[PDB]
Design a binder for this molecule. Structure first.
Ligand code: URA
Ligand code: SF4
Length: 207
């Protein structure tokens, strides 16, 4: 598949890239979503962070990581002494994939297929080309697999500094737990997992 490639313009300007993502039809996810959600921040960023996809909040705000997972993430960044205004924050897939359940308090996100990730990956390539980050934080399974391969296991490479040639700039790559995984479950387990997120964020910051 060609995917998003036909829709990515020959430019490194983020505002231009964001606009053209708004017209992307490189998989079927544009149809039900409200709008594309491009990355936030600037091309001076040293650290890029990539999540899975916009959720419910993000689909309507037009910005990444503005819901509960994003508030958790801010708490982690803060403890790692990282200013979020200095990052470029984005997602592997740029349109919200979702459903609704009866009695639901919100739209429930559905995991992008590997095919959708590969379809949308040209946007990530363009973002990386535009920003030239020194390090990329891969937030959770989908984002990590997008760069590291569909077989990659986030849980097994926590806190490791990774590199593949496959990527623009040969930044270091640090794969970590998705902040939404820390929202729920037993208290000791959340707190432990949170401490590891802070650690992995510091690994990325010290590259
Ligand atoms: O931006 C976001 C928000 C929630 N979950 C993600 O993966 N990315
Ligand atoms: S999800 Fe990515 S590839 Fe699919 S339509 Fe939206 S922007 Fe294009």
């Amino acid at each position: 598949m060609a995917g998003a490639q036909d829709f990515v313009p020959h430019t490194a300007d983020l505002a231009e890239l964001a606009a053209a993502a708004g017209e992307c039809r490189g998989c079927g996810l544009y149809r039900d979503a409200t709008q594309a959600v491009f990355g936030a921040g600037g091309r001076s960023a040293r650290i890029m962070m990539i999540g899975e996809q916009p959720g419910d909040k993000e689909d309507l705000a037009g910005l990444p990581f503005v819901g509960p997972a994003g508030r958790l993430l801010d708490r982690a960044l803060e403890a790692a002494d990282i200013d979020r205004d200095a990052l470029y924050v984005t997602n592997a897939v740029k349109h919200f994939k979702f459903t609704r359940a009866a009695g639901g308090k919100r739209r429930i996100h559905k995991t992008p297929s590997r095919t959708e990730v590969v379809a949308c990956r040209p946007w990530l390539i363009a973002e990386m080309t535009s920003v030239e980050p020194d390090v990329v934080v891969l937030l959770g399974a989908t984002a990590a697999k997008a760069l590291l391969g569909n077989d990659f296991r986030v849980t097994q490479h926590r806190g490791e500094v990774l590199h593949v040639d496959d990527v623009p700039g040969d930044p270091a790559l640090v794969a970590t737990v998705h902040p939404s995984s820390l929202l729920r479950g037993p208290k000791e387990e959340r707190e432990s997992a949170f401490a590891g997120l802070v650690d992995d964020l510091r690994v990325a910051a010290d590259v």
